[PDB]
C-alpha cells in the first residue's frame, strides 16, 4: 500500500522498494549460481542438472526465434528469465508483512516504475545498437522503400514497443500484489489455499512469456 520510496537520498529521490528488492534478488540469484558452479562434475548432478535444464530451455527458446547469432544475447535473455522467475517466486513466498518499514513497504523489484522501465530501456538500447550493427549506420529499420507513409510510424513503434512490454510486466506483477495483499487482508489465510496454485502457475508462465517476448524483440532487432 506504500509503494513510492523512502528518503534515502543519493543525489536524487530514489525508490526504496526498487533498491532493496532488486539488490537482494540479484544477490540471492548470484549466490545460488556461484556457489554451485564451483565444483561441477561432467555428469549433471544435483543442482547442475537444474541449472543446465534452465540453460537448455534458454538455448531452445533462443535458437527457435532470433536468427544465426542469438548466442551472445543468450546471457541477456537468460539473466532476464532468471530474474523474473526468482522475483515472482519471492513475491509469492518470501515474507514481507511481518517485517515493517517506517516510511514505506518492500515487496518486489517490479512493483515500482524503475525496475521495469529499466528493463524496457536496456532492451531498447540493445535493439537500437543491434539494428545499427546488423544493418547500416545511415538509416536503421526506419527507412521506407515500399510505402510513403510508414516513415514516422516506424520510429513511433520502435518507441512504443519497449514501454508496451514494460506495461505488460506492470499489469502482471501489480495485479499479483493486489491479489496477495487483499487475499491475506480478507481474514486468516484459509482462503488463499486454491488461489496460491493459480498465482504460482501465472508467475511461472509470466517468466516464460517475458523470456520469449525478449527473444522475439531481439529477433526484430536482427530483422
Amino acid at each position: 500500500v506504500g509503494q513510492h520510496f523512502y528518503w534515502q537520498i543519493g543525489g536524487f529521490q530514489i525508490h526504496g522498494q526498487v533498491l532493496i528488492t532488486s539488490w537482494v534478488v540479484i544477490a540471492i540469484l548470484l549466490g545460488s549460481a556461484a556457489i554451485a558452479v564451483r565444483s561441477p562434475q561432467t555428469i549433471p548432478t544435483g543442482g547442475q542438472n537444474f541449472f543446465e535444464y534452465v540453460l537448455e530451455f534458454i538455448r531452445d527458446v533462443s535458437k527457435t526465434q532470433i536468427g544465426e547469432e542469438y548466442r551472445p544475447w543468450v546471457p541477456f535473455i537468460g539473466t532476464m528469465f532468471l530474474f523474473i522467475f526468482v522475483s515472482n517466486w519471492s513475491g509469492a513466498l518470501l515474507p514481507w508483512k511481518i517485517i515493517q518499514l517506517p516510511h514505506g513497504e518492500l515487496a518486489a523489484p517490479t512493483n515500482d516504475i524503475n525496475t521495469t522501465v529499466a528493463l524496457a530501456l536496456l532492451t531498447s538500447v540493445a535493439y537500437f545498437y543491434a539494428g545499427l550493427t546488423k544493418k547500416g549506420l545511415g538509416y536503421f529499420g526506419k527507412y521506407i522503400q515500399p510505402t510513403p507513409i510508414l516513415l514516422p510510424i516506424n520510429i513511433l513503434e520502435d518507441f512504443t514497443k519497449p514501454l508496451s512490454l514494460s506495461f505488460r510486466l506492470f499489469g502482471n506483477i501489480l495485479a499479483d500484489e493486489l491479489v496477495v495483499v487483499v487475499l491475506v487482508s480478507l481474514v486468516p489465510l484459509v482462503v488463499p489455499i486454491p488461489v496460491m496454485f493459480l498465482g504460482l502457475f501465472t508467475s511461472g508462465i509470466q517468466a516464460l512469456i517475458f523470456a520469449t517476448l525478449a527473444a522475439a524483440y531481439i529477433g526484430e532487432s536482427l530483422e
Binding site: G10, I14, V18, L19, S22, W23, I26, L29, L30, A33, A34, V37, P40, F51, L55, V74, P75, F76, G78, T79, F83, N114, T115, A118, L121, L122
Partner: peptide
C-alpha cells in the same frame, strides 16, 4: 541507475562464471 549497473554487472559476471562451463 545503480540498479541498471548492478543488473549489468550480475549478467556479465554470471555469464562468465556460469554459462560456458
Amino acid at each position: 541507475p545503480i540498479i541498471m549497473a548492478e543488473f549489468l554487472f550480475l549478467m556479465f559476471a554470471l555469464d562468465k562464471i556460469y554459462y560456458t562451463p
